[PDB]
Amino acid sequence: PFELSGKWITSYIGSSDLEKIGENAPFQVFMRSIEFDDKESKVYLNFFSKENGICEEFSLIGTKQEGNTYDVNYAGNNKFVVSYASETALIISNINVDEEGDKTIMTGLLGKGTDIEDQDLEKFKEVTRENGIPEENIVNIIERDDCPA
Ligand SMILES: Cc1ccc(C(C)C)c(O)c1
């Protein structure tokens, strides 16, 4: 029996648009926890992000939709799916349409905290590639995450 809810920390993030994941960008997301509430058809996301170099915390709520996607508002509109789930990781695929109407596909590897399993990393790189995102568009978040636990 797989437990998807709980503590999840971001390891890596891939993006079709580099402007969304660099320094202090909306999508350089340092995840802390994800709680799935199938009973109420919602998902709870807690994470840190940086603006002006300082850590800011967000606690969002997404709504479960068709298939096994989730809609959530943040720096525009987002539709994400947990593409992969193991005992040690989660790989999220997200499609963001920002305020300007520009569409960006992104991927993220989440783990239980800092020590990455290569088996999970290879699946993330594979998912990222399948989404048309180049290897050079992958950022190592572990090295950038200096926000509070
Ligand atoms: C809406 C949304 C989508 C994706 C992520 C990470 C997987 C990068 C979020 O933190 C939030």
CA distance 56 to 16: 24
The SS3 call for residue 113 is: coil
Please report how many Cα atoms fall inside a 13 Å half-sphere around the Cα of residue 95, on the Cβ side.
Answer: 10
Residue whose CA is at the smallest distance from ligand 1 atom 3: 94
DSSP character string of 26-83: TT--EEEEEEEETTTTEEEEEEEEEETTEEEEEEEEEEE-STTEEEEESSSEEEEEEE
Task: State the resolution, in angstroms.
Answer: 2.1
Q: Which residues, judged by CB distance below 6 Å to any ligand atom, belong to the binding site of ligand 1? A: 13, 27, 29, 45, 47, 72, 74, 78, 80, 92, 94, 106, 108
Closest residue by Cα to residue 89 from 20, 14, 1, 6: 6
- Residue 94 Cα, ligand 1 centroid: separation in angstroms? 7
Distances (CA, A) of 144 to 22, 48, 65, 87, 112: 10, 12, 32, 24, 17
Amino acid at position 147, single letter: C
CB 111 within 8 A of CB 88: yes
Residues after which the chain has a gap (C–N > 2.5 Å): none
Listed by start position, the domains of the chain span: 1-149
Helix, strand, coil percentages for the chain (3-state, nearest 5): 15, 50, 40
* DSSP H/E element including 120: helix 118-130
- The dihedral built from the CA positions of residue 13, 19, 20 and 25, taken in this order, carries a sign that is positive
Strands of 138-140's sheet in order across: 6-7, 30-37, 42-51, 54-64, 69-73, 77-85, 89-97, 103-111, 9-15, 138-140
- The dihedral built from the CA positions of residue 100, 127, 18 and 13, taken in this order, carries a sign that is positive
CATH assignment, 1-149: 2.40.128.20
Amino acid at position 7, single letter: K
Q: Which atom of ligand 1 is nearest to the CA of 108?
A: 7
Distances (CA, A) of 72 to 42, 79, 95, 99, 105: 10, 7, 10, 14, 15
Location of structure tokens 């048309």: 132
Q: Which two tokens stand for residue 149?
A: 């636990």
CA distance 134 to 16: 8
